[PDB]
Amino acid sequence: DIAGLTPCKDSKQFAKREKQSIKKLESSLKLYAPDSAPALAINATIEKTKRRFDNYGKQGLLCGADGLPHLIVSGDQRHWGEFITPGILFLYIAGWIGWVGRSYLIAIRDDKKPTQKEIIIDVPLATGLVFRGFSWPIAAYRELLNGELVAKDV
Amino acid sequence: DWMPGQPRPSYLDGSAPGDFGFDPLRLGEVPENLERFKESELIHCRWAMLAVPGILVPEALGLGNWVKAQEWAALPGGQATYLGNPVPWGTLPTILVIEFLSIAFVEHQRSMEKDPEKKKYPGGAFDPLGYSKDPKKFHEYKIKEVKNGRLALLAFVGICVQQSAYPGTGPLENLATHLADPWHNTIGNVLIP
Amino acid sequence: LNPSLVISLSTGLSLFLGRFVFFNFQRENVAKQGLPEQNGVTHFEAGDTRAKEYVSLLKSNDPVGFNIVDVLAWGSIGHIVAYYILATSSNGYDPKF
Amino acid sequence: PPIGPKRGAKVKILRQESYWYKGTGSVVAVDQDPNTRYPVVVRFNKVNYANVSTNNYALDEVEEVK
Amino acid sequence: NLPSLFVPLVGLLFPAVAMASLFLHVEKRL
Amino acid sequence: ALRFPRFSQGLAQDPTTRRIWFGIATAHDFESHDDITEGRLYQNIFASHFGQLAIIFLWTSGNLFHVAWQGNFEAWVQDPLHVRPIAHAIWDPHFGQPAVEAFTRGGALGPVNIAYSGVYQWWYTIGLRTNEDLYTGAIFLLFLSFISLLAGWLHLQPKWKPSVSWFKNAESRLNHHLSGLFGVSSLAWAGHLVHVAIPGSRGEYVRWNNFLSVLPHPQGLGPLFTGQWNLYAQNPDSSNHLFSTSQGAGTAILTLLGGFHPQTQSLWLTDMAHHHLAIAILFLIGGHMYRTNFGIGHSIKYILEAHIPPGGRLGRGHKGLYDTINNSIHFQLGLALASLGVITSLVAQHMYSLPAYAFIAQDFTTQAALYTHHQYIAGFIMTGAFAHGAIFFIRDYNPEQNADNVLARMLEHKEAIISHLSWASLFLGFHTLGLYVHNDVMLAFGTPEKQILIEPIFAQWIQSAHGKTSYGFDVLLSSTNSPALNAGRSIWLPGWLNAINENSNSLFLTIGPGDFLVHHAIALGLHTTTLILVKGALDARGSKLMPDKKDFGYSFPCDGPGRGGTCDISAWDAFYLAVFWMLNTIGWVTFYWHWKHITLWQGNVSQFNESSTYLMGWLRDYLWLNSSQLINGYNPFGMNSLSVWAWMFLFGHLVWATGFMFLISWRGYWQELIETLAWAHERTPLANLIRWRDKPVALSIVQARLVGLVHFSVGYIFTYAAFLIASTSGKFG
Amino acid sequence: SHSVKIYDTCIGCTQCVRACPTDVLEMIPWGGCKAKQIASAPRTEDCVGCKRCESACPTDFLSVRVYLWHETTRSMGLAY
Amino acid sequence: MRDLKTYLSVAPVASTLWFAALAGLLIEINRFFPDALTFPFF
Ligand code: CLA
Ligand code: CLA
Ligand code: CLA
Ligand code: CLA
Ligand code: CLA
Ligand SMILES: CC1=C(/C=C/C(C)=C/C=CC(/C)=C/C=C\C=C(C)/C=C/C=C(C)/C=C/C2=C(C)CCCC2(C)C)C(C)(C)CCC1
Ligand code: SF4
Ligand SMILES: [Ca+2]
C-alpha cells in the first residue's frame, strides 16, 4: 500500500503475532484447572487479544514487515482516524481547558487578593465557567476579531 | 467603487486612470511604490494585450496552440515555422541572441528615462495619429487602455491555468470542449476531479 | 562550431553593449554606490596604504571614459558567454519532451 | 502649581532598569520639594524580586496613561 | 632503538624540565 | 606586571593560587589584558593565526612520517580490503609479554595501533603509493610549518605589522578569498586530480620527475580552448575496473557519472576532478563582486543600507550593520563558527553516504570514527558560535549605531523568541518522550501491537523524490513521466539511480518509525540547545532580574543571594549549560548513526527497525550487547588488543564522574576545608620548614563550572570513543 | 580590591551600612533625598564582596553596586 | 462547616478529587473500549 506497507489483514507477520500471543497465553492456561479463576482470567485475556487484533485489521491499519500497525499522519483520507480526527478531538479538549482556566483568571483578577482564589479554588465560579469551553472555538474567535484575546502593547 | 460598502483607501482618490479603489494589502502605501506600480501595471497590461491576440489567432488557423508553437527548440535541430514556412533563423541560439540584444536594448531605454510620466505614457513618436490631442479623450483612452489591459491579463491567467488543467491543449480547444457540453465539461470537473 | 567566430562575436557584442548601451546605467549606479568605506570614511583615509585607487590606470583618452578595466570586465563577460555557447554546442545534450 | 501628575493616576514606568518597566502603577505622593531628582512615588500591584511594592521615580521617568 | 631514546625523553625528561622551568617562572618576582 | 601573568596586574597581585589558574585561562583573551589597543589586538590575532597554521602543518607532517616509518601503506596498497592500516608503533615499558603479543597485528614487528582516521584510503585515492611519497609530503609540511612561523614572526615587527584599516578592508579580503583561497585552490586541486590522481588510478605513477612528460589526456589542452570540452569525457573507466591497475581503464579526465566506482565503492575520481574545477571557476567569477582599487565593484556598506523594506516591518533594515560587524571581531568569529559548524556537520552527513576515498566504505570502524569525530567537533563549534554572539552583545554592541535595525529588533522582542523556542522544546520533549514511554509500556506488557509507530512518510517521500523505490510513491526520479527524470537520464541519473537503490551502501538508507522517533529527539536536542544559547545571548546585556548585566561582563560567578538568588545568571553560564545539551544532542545523533550502521554491517537491519522504537531496546540491544568484546578486553583469564579500550572505557567513566564533584559540590565547603588544612601544615613539625609561596584557596565558582564541564566532556568523548571503536573494530563489521 | 559604588537613587535608609560585615559603607550628609543622607564606600580595601548590602537595598534598581574586581588577601577573607 | 468546605477547595484536595474522577473516567473508557490505536467511528 502506502510507503511499501501492507494492510494488517493481509500481513502474515500480523497473524503470526496473534497466533504466538494466544498460544503463549494458552501455554500459561494449561497449568490451571478449567473451572479456576486464573483460567477465566487467562481466557478473558485471550478473547481480549482476539478482539484487539481483529479491530486493528478491520479498520484498515497498515502493517510493516514487523507485523505491527504503522500510522500514517500525512493526511491521507484513508487513515484520518489515526491522527487528524483524534487530533481535532484533542485540540477541542485542550482549547476547552485553556479557555476555562483563562476565564477563571480573568474573573478573579479584580479580587482584593487574587492570589487567594488561586490557592483556594472558587468552586462555584469554576462550575459556572467549566461549560463555556463547550463553545470555546466561537468565544475565542469572536474575542480575536474584537481585540479581547490579546493584551494591547505587551 | 470596486466593492460598494467598503471605505476607499486614503491614497486612492479616484483621479488616476483605473482608480476603482483596489488595494487591500496597501501595496501602494508609498507614493514611490504607487507610481512605480502605475508604470509596471501598464507594461503588464500592454504585454498581455499583445499576447492574447498572438496566443489565440494562430490557433484559429492550421498552426497549433501557443504551447506547441514554441516546441522546435526542445529538440536539437529545431527549425521555426512562421505560417508553415521554415524560416532560416529557426535555431534556438539564433533567436535567443537576437531577442536578448533587441529586447534588452529597448526595454532598458525605458529604465534610463525617469519622468516618471514618460515611463507611463511617453507618446511623441509613439503617438503619430495624435490621440493625445484632447486631454479628456486622452484620459478616457487611458481608462480604455487599463481596462483592456486588465482584461487581457485576466485572460492570460485563464490561458495558463487552463493549460495546466489540460496539459497540451488550446484555449479555443478548451472553449470547444465547453461548447460540446457546458453542463458536464466545466471547471467543476477540474475543481472536483 | 568555430571558436574564433563565437569568441569574437560574443566579446564584440559584450564590449559593444558595455560601451554604447550599458554604460550610463553602469556609471550612474557606480556613482551612487560609491567607494567602500570603514567608519564613515574610505579605506585609504582610515590608514590602509594599499587602498588608494589607481586613477592613472583609469586614465583613458576615450571620449566617454572607456579605460582598460572596462575592457577587461566586458571582455571577460564575452569570453565566458562565448565558451558557454561553445561548450553547450559540443556536448550534444538533449532532454526528452 | 502642582508639579508632576496628580495623585492616584496610572503611570507608565519608563525607567528601563525597573522591575515594572513598560508596565503601569499608581501614584501616591509627588514631592514638590525641588533638588529631589526622584519625587514621584508609585505603588505597584505585584511585588518585585525584592518583595518591594513601592519605588521613587523622576518626572521624565513616568508617563501618565489612562 | 629510537623509541628507547625519545619516549623517555618526552615522557620523563621533557615534563621534568618543563614543569621545573614553569615553576621557576611562575614563582619568580620582580 | 611584575610577575606572572605579565598581561594582568590584578592577577599578578593575587596572593593566592588563583593567580596561576586565571593567568592560564586568560592568556588568549587579548582584549582584557593591560594596555591593549586596536592595533595590538589585530596584530596578536594575526600572529596567532600563523602559529595555528604552523601547528596544523606540523601535525599533518607527523602523521605522514609515522605512516611511512612504522606503518603499512606500501603493503596496504596491495590489499586494500585485507590489510589493517597502522597508526604508529607502541613502545610502553609497562607492557607485559602478552600485551606485546596481542598488540602485534597489521603485519608489523612490534606492537602497533590500527589507524582509524582514514588517511590510508585518503592518500591512496589522491595518488600517494609508496612510503617515499609520504616522506616527501612530511618534509614539505614540516617546511610549510616553518614558513608559517616565519610569517607570524615577520608581521610582528614595525613596518610589517598592518594598520587596523588594513584588517578592516573587507571588500579586498572577500575578493581574494573567493578568487584565490577558494577558487584557485580548488582549480589547482582539480589539476592534481587530472595529472596525478586519475593517472595514478589507472596504473600511471606520475611524480615530479615525469609529470612534465606525460599527457593527462591524449588530445590534451586543445579542446579546452575550442569549446569542445566533451572530448575530456569520452572514455571513462569501465564498471569492471581495478583501481591500481589498467584493465578497464579509460582516458577521460572530467566526467559526470553520478554513481560510485563499483570496486572501491567511492565517488568517481573524474567526477571529483570535474567537481572541483566547476566550483573553482564559479568561485573565480564570484570573487570579482566587491570594489577595490579599479573603480568597479560593490560597497558592502551601501548594499546593506539599501536593503530596507518600505512599510518598516524591519524598521531601518540593515543600516549600520557594516561597521557593526567590521569593528567587532566577536561578530565575525560568531558568523565564522556558525558557518563552519554547519558545513562540518555537512561533511559528516556526506562522507558516510557519499564516500570519496577508495576502499574506505568497507573500513566500518573508520567510517564510524570519522562521523562521530566531526559531529562532536561541529557540536562544540556551534556552542562557540553562540557563545561569541553573546560576547559581541556585551563587549562590542553599540545600541545607538544599531538603532531600529534588525539587530536591535532582536533584542526588542527577546521574550517572543525565547518563549517560542521554549514552546517548541516543550512540545517536542513532551510528545517524543511520551511516545517512547508508551511503546516501552506496551512491550513490557507483551503487547507490541499497541505501539504508536508513526511512518516518517515525509522523508520517505523525499527519498522517493530522489529515485528510491522502497516506498513506491511514484514522484519525480521515481516516476517515468516527470521532466526531472527525463532531463537527467543522459548524465548523472544512471549512476545516481544505480547507487541510491543499492542495498549495500548508505546513500539514503531505508527509514522506518524508529527513525521518526530519533529524528524528533534530534529536533528536541537542537531546539533546547538553541533555546539555552539564544536566551543567554539575548539576556546577556540585561534582564528583569539583573538590568545591568552588561556592566558585569560576560563571565562572573553570580550577583549574590539577594533578590531571591542569582546563580548561573551570566551568559557564560548559559554556554556552560548548553554544552551539556550539546553533548546530549550529539550523543543521540551518534547513538543513532552507529546502531543503524552496526546492524546494517551485520546484515540485521530488522533488529534496529524493531528495537529502536522503544528505549529498553536502546539500552539492551545497543549498549549492553555491543559492550561484550569491549569489557572482555581484559578479564581474569587474560586480555587481547581490545584491552586498551576497556581501560579507556573505564577511564572515561572516571573523568566524567569526577566532573560531577565540581558541578554538584560548590566552593564554600572546600574553602573552609582548605583553611583547616593550612592550620594543619603550619602546626606540623618538620614540614612547617616548607612554606607555600601562594596561598591555598578553593577554586573559583566559574572555575569550578569550567573544570566540571571539562571533566564531563572529556569523559563523555573518551567513553564513547572507546566503546565505538572497540565494538566496531572488534567485529570489523 | 572590589569596587563599590553608590548611585543617587539612594533614599538614605542606612541598610547597606548595617548589613556590611567589614565596615566599608558610611552615611554622609546629602541634599538629594528626604533623610538628608547618602551612602559612600570609603573603605573598599576591606570589602569582601558578600553583597550583603545589595540584599538589603529597597531601591529599584539597586543603589549599592558591588563590582567584584582584583582579589587581595583582605577581599578573599583569608585568616592565613 | 464553611471552614471545612473552604479546606476541600484547597489546591491539593481539589486536584486529588479532580484527578481521581478523571482517572476513573479514563479507566472505564479504556475498559469499555480497550486498546484502540485509531478513531474507528469515522
Ligand atoms: C605534531 C606531530 C607529531 C606528533 C603528534 C608525534 C607523536 C609521536 N612521535 Mg614524532 N616526530 C615528528 C612529529 C610528531 N610526532 C616529526 C616532525 C619528527 C621528525 C621527522 C618526529 C620524529 C619522531 C621519532 C624519531 C620518534 C617519534 C616518536 C613519537 C611517539 C612518541 C612520542 C615522542 O617521542 O615525541 C616526539 C619526539 C620528537 C623528536 C618529535 C619532536 C620534533 C618535531 C620537529 C616537533 C617539534 C617539537 C617542538 C620542540 C615543540 C612542538 C610544539 C607542540 C606542537 C608540541 C608519538 C606518538 C617516537 C616513537 O616512534 O614512539 C614509538 C620516536 O622514535 N617522532
Ligand atoms: C610517560 C612516560 C613514562 C615513561 C617513559 C615511564 C617509564 C617507566 N616507568 Mg612509569 N609512570 C608514568 C610515566 C612513564 N613511565 C606516569 C605518568 C605514571 C603515573 C601513573 C607512572 C607510574 C609508574 C609506576 C608506579 C612505576 C613506573 C615504572 C616505570 C619503569 C618500568 C619499566 C622498567 O622496569 O624499567 C626499569 C626499572 C627500574 C627500577 C630501573 C629504573 C630506571 C632508572 C633508575 C631511571 C633513572 C632516573 C634518572 C636518574 C632521573 C629521571 C628523572 C629526570 C629526567 C629528571 C619504566 C622505566 C615502574 C618502576 O619505576 O619500577 C620501580 C613502577 O613502579 N611508572
Ligand atoms: C489557565 C492555565 C494556563 C494557560 C491558559 C496557559 C497558556 C499558555 N502557556 Mg502555560 N503553564 C501553566 C498554565 C497555563 N498556561 C502552568 C500552571 C504552568 C506551570 C507548570 C505553565 C507553564 C508554562 C511553560 C513553561 C510554558 C507555558 C507556555 C504557554 C503558552 C503556550 C501554550 C503551552 O505551551 O501551554 C502548555 C501548558 C503547560 C506546559 C502546563 C499546563 C497545565 C494545565 C493543563 C494548565 C492549568 C489549568 C488550570 C490549573 C485550570 C484551572 C481551573 C479553574 C477553572 C479553576 C500558552 C499561551 C509556553 C510559552 O511560553 O509560550 C510560548 C511555555 O514555555 N506555560
Ligand atoms: C576559532 C574558534 C575560537 C576562537 C578564536 C575563540 C577565541 C576566544 N574564546 Mg572561544 N569558544 C570556541 C571557539 C573559539 N574561541 C568554541 C568552539 C567554544 C565552545 C566550546 C568556545 C567557548 C568559549 C567560552 C565559554 C569562552 C571563550 C572565550 C574566548 C576568548 C578568550 C579565550 C581564552 O583566552 O581562554 C583560554 C582557553 C584555554 C586556557 C583552554 C583551556 C580549557 C581547555 C578546553 C581544556 C583542554 C581539554 C582537556 C584538558 C584536554 C584533553 C584531555 C586529555 C586527557 C586528552 C577568545 C578571544 C572566553 C572569553 O573570553 O569570553 C569573553 C570564554 O569564557 N570561548
Ligand atoms: C588570493 C590572495 C589571498 C590568499 C590566497 C589568501 C589566503 C589566506 N588568508 Mg588572506 N588576505 C588577502 C589575500 C589572500 N589571502 C588580502 C588581499 C588581504 C587584505 C584584505 C588579506 C587579509 C587576511 C587576513 C587579515 C587574514 C588572512 C588570512 C588567510 C588564511 C586563511 C586561513 C586558512 O588558511 O584557511 C584555509 C581556507 C581554505 C583552505 C579554503 C576554504 C576551506 C573550505 C571552506 C573547506 C575545506 C575544503 C575541502 C572540503 C577540504 C577537504 C579536506 C581535506 C583536504 C583533508 C589563508 C591561507 C588569515 C591569516 O592570515 O591566517 C594566517 C587572516 O587573519 N588574510
Ligand atoms: C583601437 C580602437 C578600436 C578597437 C578596439 C579593440 C578591437 C579592442 C579590444 C578588446 C578586446 C577584444 C578585449 C577582450 C577580452 C578581454 C578579456 C579580459 C578576456 C578574457 C577571458 C577570460 C576571462 C577567460 C576565462 C576562462 C578561462 C580562463 C578558461 C575557462 C573558460 C573561461 C572562458 C571562463 C575601435 C576602432 C573599436 C575604437 C577606437 C579604438
Ligand atoms: S559586598 Fe559585603 S563587604 Fe562589600 S561593601 Fe557590600 S556588604 Fe560590605
Ligand atoms: Ca542505498
Q: Subunits with at least 3 CB pairs below 8 A relative to chain D? A: F, G
Q: How many CB atoms lie within 10 A of CB G40?
A: 17
Residue minimizing CA distance to atom 4 of ligand 5: F181
Kindly identify the ligand whose nearest atom is closest to the C-alpha of E18.
Answer: 2
CA B101 to chain CA centroid, nearest Å: 22
- Number of helices (H), then strands (E), belonging to chain H: the values are 2, 0
Closest atom, ligand 2, to C-alpha of E16: 55
Strands G26-29 and G37-40, how do they pair? antiparallel
Distance (Å, rounded) from C-alpha D12 to C-alpha D65? 6
Tell me which chain C residues have a C-beta less than 8 angstroms from the C-beta of B93: 85, 89
Exp. method: X-ray
Give the best residue of A6, A19, A74 to mutate against chain F (max F CB count within 10 A). A74
Beta-carbon contacts of F226 under 8 Å, excluding residues fewer than 6 positions away, are C3, C86
Strands F453-454 and A69-71, how do they pair? parallel
What backbone phi and psi angles, to 5 degrees, belong to D5? -80, 165
Is residue F93 lining ligand 1, measured as CB closer than 6 Å? no
Kindly identify the ligand whose nearest atom is closest to the C-alpha of A102.
Answer: 3
CB contact under 8 A, D49 and F547: no
Distance (Å, rounded) from C-alpha F628 to C-alpha F153? 53
Tell me which chain G residues have a C-beta less than 8 angstroms from the C-beta of D52: 58, 60
Take residue E24 and report the three cell numbers written for it.
Answer: 621557576
User: From the CA of F177, how far away is ligand 5's center (Å)?
Assistant: 6
Kindly identify the ligand whose nearest atom is closest to the C-alpha of F338.
Answer: 4
C-beta separation of F308 from F314 below 8 A: yes
Distance (Å, rounded) from C-alpha B185 to C-alpha B13? 43
CB-based contacts of F563-569 (< 8 A; 24+ apart in sequence): F563/D49, F563/D50, F563/G54, F563/G55, F564/D49, F568/F705, F569/F543, F569/F545
User: From the CA of F29, how far away is ligand 4's center (Å)?
Assistant: 9
Take residue F446 and report the three cell numbers written for it.
Answer: 507483551
Q: Which domain holds residue H25?
A: 1-42
Distance (Å, rounded) from C-alpha F597 to C-alpha E15? 42
Instruction: From F144, F141, F177, select the one nearest F50 (Cα to Cα).
Output: F144
- Number of helices (H), then strands (E), belonging to chain D: the values are 0, 5
| Segments in F292-328 forming alpha helices (H) | 300-306, 321-326
Half-sphere exposure of residue F181: CA atoms within 13 angstroms, side-chain side: 7
Cα end-to-end distance, chain F, whole Å: 59
CB contact under 8 A, F311 and B32: no
Is residue A42 lining ligand 3, measured as CB closer than 6 Å? no
Annotated binding-site residues of A read 74, 77
C-beta separation of F661 from F708 below 8 A: yes
Handedness of CA F246, F250, F252, F256 (dihedral sign): negative
Distance (Å, rounded) from C-alpha F452 to C-alpha G49? 56
Burial (CB count within 10 angstroms: exposed 0-12, middle 13-18, buried 19+), residue A23: exposed
Residue minimizing CA distance to atom 35 of ligand 1: E10
Tell me which chain G residues have a C-beta less than 8 angstroms from the C-beta of D17: 60-61
C-beta separation of G52 from G77 below 8 A: no
Beta pairing partners, F300: none
Q: How many domains is chain C built from?
A: 1
Q: What angle do CA B156, B158, B163 make, to 5 degrees?
A: 100
Distance (Å, rounded) from C-alpha B146 to C-alpha F717? 70
Burial (CB count within 10 angstroms: exposed 0-12, middle 13-18, buried 19+), residue F388: buried
Annotated binding-site residues of A for chlorophyll a read 74, 77
DSSP H/E element including G62: none
User: In a mutational test of the pocket of ligand 4, which residue from F29, F329, F395, F717 has the highest number of ligand atoms less than 8 Å from its CB?
Assistant: F29
Residue minimizing CA distance to atom 33 of ligand 5: F53
**Residue F656 to residues F517, F580, F648, F717, G5, Cα–Cα distance (Å):** 28, 12, 12, 9, 42
**Residue F360 to residues C63, F117, F259, F367, Cα–Cα distance (Å):** 63, 10, 16, 7
C-beta separation of F476 from F484 below 8 A: yes
Tell me which chain F residues have a C-beta less than 8 angstroms from the C-beta of G75: none
Q: Which domain holds residue G25?
A: 1-80
G67 in F contact zone (CB under 8 Å): yes
Closest atom, ligand 1, to C-alpha of E2: 64
Report the 3 state secondary structure along chain B. Answer: CCCCCCCCCCCCCCCCCCCCCCCCCCCCCCHHHHHHHHHHHHHHHHHHHHHHHHHHHHHHCCCCCCCCCCCCCCCCCCCCEECCEECCCCCHHHHHHHHHHHHHHHHHHHHHCCCCCCCCCCCHHHCCCCCCCCCCHHHHHHHHHHHHHHHHHHHHHHHHHHHHHCCCCCHHHHHHHHHHCCCCCCHHHHHCC
C-beta separation of F285 from F178 below 8 A: no
Distance (Å, rounded) from C-alpha F225 to C-alpha C2? 11
Looking at chain H from residue 6 to 25, which residues have their Cβ under 8 Å from any Cβ of chain A?
A: 6, 9-11, 14
C-beta separation of F473 from A48 below 8 A: no
Take residue F220 and report the three cell numbers written for it.
Answer: 590534451
What backbone phi and psi angles, to 5 degrees, belong to F326? -70, -15
CATH of residue H32's domain is 1.20.5.510
Residue minimizing CA distance to atom 12 of ligand 1: F62
Residue minimizing CA distance to atom 15 of ligand 6: C75
Tell me which chain A residues have a C-beta less than 8 angstroms from the C-beta of H10: 119-121
Report the 3 state secondary structure along F66-77. Answer: HHHHCCCHHHHH
User: From the CA of F45, how far away is ligand 5's center (Å)?
Assistant: 14
Q: How far does A124 lie from chain F, in Å, by closest CA?
A: 32
Cα end-to-end distance, chain D, whole Å: 22
Q: Where are the domains of chain F?
A: 1-733
Closest atom, ligand 1, to C-alpha of E9: 34
Burial (CB count within 10 angstroms: exposed 0-12, middle 13-18, buried 19+), residue F690: exposed
Distance (Å, rounded) from C-alpha B91 to C-alpha F115? 59
At which residue does the C-alpha cell 567511492 appear? F266
Cα end-to-end distance, chain C, whole Å: 25
Q: How many domains is chain H built from?
A: 1
CA F671 to chain CA centroid, nearest Å: 39
Take residue F329 and report the three cell numbers written for it.
Answer: 571581531
Ligand 4 binding pocket, CB closer than 6 Å = F 24-29, 333, 337, 380-381, 383-384, 387, 391, 554-555, 572, 575, 710, 714
**Residue B103 to residues B97, B112, B125, C17, C25, Cα–Cα distance (Å):** 10, 14, 19, 13, 16
User: In a mutational test of the pocket of ligand 7, which residue from G24, G25, G27, G57 has the highest number of ligand atoms less than 8 Å from its CB?
Assistant: G24
A87 in H contact zone (CB under 8 Å): no
Q: How far does D19 lie from chain F, in Å, by closest CA?
A: 6
Ligand 6 binding pocket, CB closer than 6 Å = C 11, 71-72, 75-76, 79-80, 83; F 281
Q: How many CB atoms lie within 10 A of CB A126?
A: 18
Distance (Å, rounded) from C-alpha F392 to C-alpha F31? 12
Residue minimizing CA distance to atom 23 of ligand 6: C76
What is residue E13's DSSP assignment?
I
C-beta separation of F134 from F67 below 8 A: yes
User: In a mutational test of the pocket of ligand 1, which residue from F66, F113, F117 has the highest number of ligand atoms less than 8 Å from its CB?
Assistant: F66
Q: How many domains is chain A built from?
A: 1
CB contact under 8 A, G60 and D55: yes
Q: Which domain holds residue C20?
A: 1-97
What single letter denotes the amino acid at residue E13?
L
What single letter denotes the amino acid at residue F211?
F
